[PDB]
Design a protein around this nucleic acid. Structure first.
Ligand code: B12
Ligand code: B12
Ligand code: B12
Ligand code: B12
Ligand SMILES: C[C@H]1O[C@@H](n2cnc3c(N)ncnc32)[C@H](O)[C@@H]1O
Ligand SMILES: C[C@H]1O[C@@H](n2cnc3c(N)ncnc32)[C@H](O)[C@@H]1O
Ligand SMILES: C[C@H]1O[C@@H](n2cnc3c(N)ncnc32)[C@H](O)[C@@H]1O
Ligand SMILES: C[C@H]1O[C@@H](n2cnc3c(N)ncnc32)[C@H](O)[C@@H]1O
Lengths: 205, 279, 273, 276
DNA sequence: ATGTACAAAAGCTTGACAAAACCTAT
DNA sequence: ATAGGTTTTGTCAAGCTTTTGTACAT
């Protein structure tokens, strides 16, 4: 009973909503096979997560339903993360700003880095800035990457707060913008694709 | 024979391994291995496991190897059961995920799935919290270690079966962000053939009740690490969530469970068996 | 792990002078350094260099021999070829690593269908063509059996009336039975895997004493089945299932067992009727 | 038979002035006292003091030598009985848990000798007496094999020229081979376990192609060995070892293999070349 | 004949040093 | 692949504590 491409998004959500983890896992493996690792994230993992938030927002599902779906999809992404290689060398620390509890954005950034041979250390979400700076210094981290989904955690930070975290500091996500990034002293990155290559090109150009 | 960890003298080792007594004390000073049990007086007492170990190192040194690497290559292969906890944390603190994953796999094969959680996963997490509390490590270092260990546990969770039938919903009370306790409960349930649906942490009670009703869940399981989230809940708040409601964790107690209308469970082992028997 | 530059020179054949030069103009290998600057190579690097020595002797330059090994993102279909090649050269460490990779991509059930099964079939065919000997097959089969048993033990084992899983007498292919047992455990069925080659009277006696709900038999060869009389499997347990390459619907009916085509519908079949 | 304080002094060598202090310091020996106070040492103590005297001359200390001899207390003996009973009732979970307790206490090598081996022998005897059927044995044997394979994978696998481990053709008992391969790996030897029942020409061909330093064969039954012609094992590998219940020194010489009594000195033997 | 004391033998720790192996560089 | 600076390693010494064999006094 092979289901059509665009029907996988719909089907996966429906499977999760009925508590069929086995069926959901199986549907995800089919997507991974069809579109590959990067592709299944963009076409399957991301659209479902956005719809889940919207569905909750419209009142079609409750918080408990969302939790089940989000925990599942996080587990699949963590699998792919561990599947990728982890090279030697100065690590890149990946997390989210304090107050930011959405972590899946950070995981995606760390995954694309690893796929390009960058030793991205994923810390988890919600890391205090002084502790982050201290860790970056001790491990001799080449860069710090922050995913911001909400804008309020960024607005709460003072000017230049991110400037001295690491030799290079990147900021992205739905909650982040170019104007806001300049104020905090970080480099704005539009998409995940360009981020790994940005680590080779210095500063502006 | 029966006891590998025994007692010997430094003179017996010098006549069994060939290495002089002066060398044995130096390798304990520069490397830490071997580290035999000490008498109340202060004299050494090597074990039989260490005796055969040193006899193996003598072969490598005679085959072309340095004592610094000959010991390090053996410590990785036949590591001490209690050194794995220390080793794993040290590996994590230096950012060596590959080394950490490898050390965990060694533990999994030795203690088994349930075993590795009690004797490796749990003691490391406790020490990490204490180390942070003492100021030895920062929050960022804890995050790295906690995220890693969570990923390993989730892997085991997915490797367990997931049988059909009315699910059991597992989560934590609102305000409770420690989720590893809930995962452990879910895992032990799956290992006993219970379809435990792990939701993640921090689930609002009305939404939890609505989901339990719609899926016809047989029970709800809550893990409370902190006590404050429980204290913030009114009396009988957990009574009507599901046909059976269980509450455990460091933040939970029998007195508090009775007030909230939930059944107190002391240990994870007895939890799966408590589902088969009526309240 | 940790090694010396002298040990590598006696394990790979490459002199110590070369190992330091390739680290200078390529960066590989880059072993962990002692506090004094001394090099400590890992076991993963040791087997790696042993592979590069093969390519250099087969006709390749060190600049490309290393680059092709560094950026070897193995394709999903290259894992089956890779795993077999690793086994045939006696590289258990490399083989185990390749298998864990596949486990994470297709998942527990996925890795069995797309990695474990195709390799076993090809091994039999390769032996049949005369490309490999029996000893080479033995190594590969024992390895893959060990991985499957590991997954079996990682699955849950629920309480309740057990399901006994084995193979008919004379049948020594046991991997088929293990697969059946595994799929059952993944669906919350307490499948007791007995091992292969179990006498029918003893099997019936055990099923009776343990109150087993069902018996499951995997037949790879057809001859063991053909040697059994009519209705031989009828009274083994309340339900008896028979599958495998050596089994068929016509033959199952004669022996008094239910034919099952796929392992997926086996667990479900244990509830509905 | 009991002896005086001077009788044991001649049967061991140690003076009576030392035997009284060993009693008033360590607690051994503890002879029965007459109403007057005379010490009567038992026969179990005379042979015991003769053992310590051999250890003390080897370079040991009384406090350690006596404490070492106190390893006479046998391990939790109910684990063997309990494990078998657990298996016989189909409780895999309970059996796995019982095995893990045995492994932590006696360790890796220890749990094999005191738990894994005794149970396997009793299972065969129980079957032989008709107390259990073949199906019962199968369940137990498959379980214990799984545990051993787990330990095998837990041990490291060093690079270098491999040692091939299997059993002679016709020999289906494979647990003996696994034990040999495990002890080799524990000593840093890259033992490649092939499984049981390997044809000799194929084994020789594999050993040659992999540049294997040695081949190790486990023989539980004697009939598969007797079926082999003279010198059949001679050219399998640079060194060829044979052991197990089915193997003997006389039989090994005929087949052109080196006989090994115990698994312990197998790994030590592969390092240094042995004579004729 | 039960028991304490004393001297010798063996251990343990801090400290240092000369040779072997190794790293980097022209 | 020659050469110089550096780290690692086996060995021993002084100062002193623990342990054990012999004996000393009742
Ligand atoms: C799952 C989820 C949660 C989970 C988080 C689980 C976890 N461990 O991560 C929980 C339950 C904790 C949660 C809580 C909340 N959430 Co929420 N949640 C979501 C949901 C469904 C998905 C989030 C997610 O990870 N999406 C996937 C990410 C990767 O997608 P994306 O951000 O669009 O990413 C793309 C690009 O931005 C880029 N990008 C992302 N990260 C990075 C990083 C870099 C470096 C770069 C270059 C690019 C980049 O990559 C992607 C490419 O397509 C979203 C729905 C949505 N529309 O996003 C709501 C959503 C984000 N949440 C929302 C809300 C309202 C909340 C709460 C405030 C609710 C509450 N009152 O409790 C809290 C806030 C908690 C906090 N303090 O942070 C709102 C946000 C509204 C707003 N922006 O004002 C959303 C949008 C839902 C909605 N209403 O539609 N949430
Ligand atoms: C990792 C971690 C975090 C992570 C959580 C990650 C995650 N996604 O789960 C983060 C960073 C979010 C965090 C935050 C905080 N934490 Co915290 N954290 C820890 C840590 C190191 C481990 C937690 C853990 O999961 N341990 C493993 C669990 C399974 O062990 P256990 O609870 O003892 O479980 C056993 C039994 O209780 C039983 N049990 C557990 N669950 C269940 C369930 C059932 C049904 C049953 C029957 C039994 C049972 O199973 C186990 C058997 O051995 C602990 C250290 C510690 N000592 O626990 C601190 C700790 C729990 N945290 C602590 C603190 C102080 C906090 C913060 C308040 C810090 C802050 N100011 O931000 C916040 C609170 C956030 C919130 N609102 O919940 C303190 C708690 C102090 C107190 N109790 O008053 C601890 C103890 C650290 C310390 N000081 O030693 N924490
Ligand atoms: C490993 C192996 C062995 C090992 C067995 C190791 C062990 N402990 O299991 C050993 C060395 C013992 C061996 C011996 C022999 N084997 Co062999 N062996 C193989 C090999 C390479 C893999 C076997 C295997 O387990 N495959 C994996 C199984 C799971 O795959 P599958 O059967 O196709 O299973 C699928 C479905 O059928 C289903 N299915 C399987 N079981 C079940 C159960 C149920 C309940 C259900 C519903 C479905 C189901 O699940 C799978 C889904 O994809 C095969 C090659 C091959 N093409 O299969 C040869 C093969 C099976 N062997 C073969 C031969 C010739 C022999 C010997 C006769 C050789 C000899 N002369 O000694 C002996 C026979 C011994 C005996 N008396 O049984 C031939 C069979 C030829 C034939 N059918 O006539 C094969 C096909 C090799 C070839 N020529 O291509 N063998
Ligand atoms: C399990 C089992 C089986 C299983 C094998 C499972 C498997 N995959 O290995 C199966 C069901 C296949 C089986 C079949 C048979 N078996 Co059976 N089986 C046993 C059992 C219970 C345990 C075997 C075992 O592995 N024991 C553990 C081994 C490691 O112990 P051990 O040999 O004493 O080993 C020690 C030393 O010898 C040393 N050693 C062992 N290997 C090596 C290797 C080296 C290099 C060195 C240095 C030392 C060494 O290590 C150990 C140290 O303590 C034994 C019982 C028993 N008393 O041994 C019967 C037993 C061996 N089997 C027996 C019989 C009768 C048979 C069958 C003939 C029955 C039949 N008619 O079908 C067949 C023969 C099949 C064949 N062609 O080989 C008899 C043997 C009688 C005899 N010697 O004449 C035994 C003794 C049972 C009994 N009657 O008490 N068997
Ligand atoms: C962004 C996501 O946050 C979840 N969400 C909304 N309110 C809460 C709360 N009080 N606690 C936990 N999760 C919540 C919803 O499920 C939404 O989908
Ligand atoms: C219980 C764990 O909570 C973490 N922790 C403490 N304070 C914060 C904070 N402000 N934000 C995030 N994590 C925090 C510490 O790392 C501790 O180990
Ligand atoms: C099905 C598998 O059986 C193996 N095989 C073939 N003949 C024998 C034999 N005499 N003994 C053991 N294994 C054998 C081959 O390796 C083949 O791959
Ligand atoms: C040595 C072991 O061999 C098993 N055994 C005895 N006869 C057979 C047979 N025909 N088939 C399979 N196993 C058998 C018994 O269970 C015994 O314990």
């Amino acid at each position: 009973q092979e289901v059509r491409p665009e029907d996988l998004g719909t089907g996966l959500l429906e499977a999760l909503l009925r508590g069929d983890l086995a069926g959901a896992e199986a549907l995800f493996r089919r997507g991974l096979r069809f579109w590959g690792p990067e592709g299944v994230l963009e076409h399957l993992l991301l659209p479902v997560l956005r719809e889940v938030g919207e569905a909750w927002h419209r009142g079609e599902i409750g918080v408990a339903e969302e939790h089940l779906a989000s925990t599942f999809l996080r587990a699949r992404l963590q699998e792919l993360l561990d599947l990728a290689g982890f090279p030697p060398g100065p690590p890149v620390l990946v997390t989210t700003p304090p107050g930011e509890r959405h972590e899946i954005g950070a995981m995606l950034a760390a995954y694309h880095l690893r796929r390009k041979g960058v030793p991205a250390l994923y810390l988890g979400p919600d890391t205090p800035l002084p502790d982050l700076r201290a860790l970056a210094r001790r491990l001799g981290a080449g860069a710090v990457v922050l995913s911001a989904v909400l804008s309020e955690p960024l607005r709460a930070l003072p000017d230049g707060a991110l400037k001295d975290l690491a030799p290079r500091v990147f900021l992205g996500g739905q909650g982040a913008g170019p104007e806001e990034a300049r104020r905090l002293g970080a480099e704005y990155m539009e998409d995940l694709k360009g981020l790994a290559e940005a680590l080779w090109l210095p500063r502006g150009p | 024979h029966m006891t590998s960890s025994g007692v010997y003298t430094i003179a017996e080792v010098e006549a069994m391994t060939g290495l002089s007594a002066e060398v044995l004390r130096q390798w304990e000073r520069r490397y830490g291995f071997p580290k035999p049990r000490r008498t109340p007086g202060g004299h050494r007492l090597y074990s039989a496991e260490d005796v055969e170990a040193l006899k193996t190192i003598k072969r490598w040194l005679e085959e072309g190897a340095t004592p610094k690497a000959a010991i390090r290559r053996y410590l990785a292969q036949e590591v001490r059961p209690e050194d794995l906890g220390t080793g794993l944390l040290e590996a994590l603190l230096r950012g060596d995920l590959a080394g950490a994953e490898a050390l965990f796999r060694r533990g999994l094969r030795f203690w088994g799935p349930e075993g590795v959680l009690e004797h490796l996963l749990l003691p490391v997490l406790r020490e990490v919290g204490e180390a942070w509390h003492r100021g030895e490590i920062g929050v960022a270092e804890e995050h790295l270690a906690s995220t890693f260990l969570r990923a390993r546990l989730q892997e085991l969770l997915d490797l367990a079966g997931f049988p059909p039938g009315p699910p059991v919903l597992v989560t934590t009370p609102p305000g409770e962000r420690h989720e590893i306790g809930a995962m452990l409960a879910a895992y032990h349930l799956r290992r006993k053939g219970v379809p435990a649906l792990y939701l993640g942490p921090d689930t609002p009670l009305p939404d939890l009740r609505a989901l339990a009703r719609r899926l016809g869940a047989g029970a709800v399981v809550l893990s409370a690490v902190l006590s404050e989230p429980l204290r913030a809940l009114p009396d009988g708040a957990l009574k009507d969530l599901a046909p059976r409601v269980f509450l455990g964790g460091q933040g939970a107690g029998p007195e508090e469970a009775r007030r909230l209308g939930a059944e107190y469970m002391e240990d994870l082992k007895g939890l799966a068996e408590a589902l088969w028997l009526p309240r």
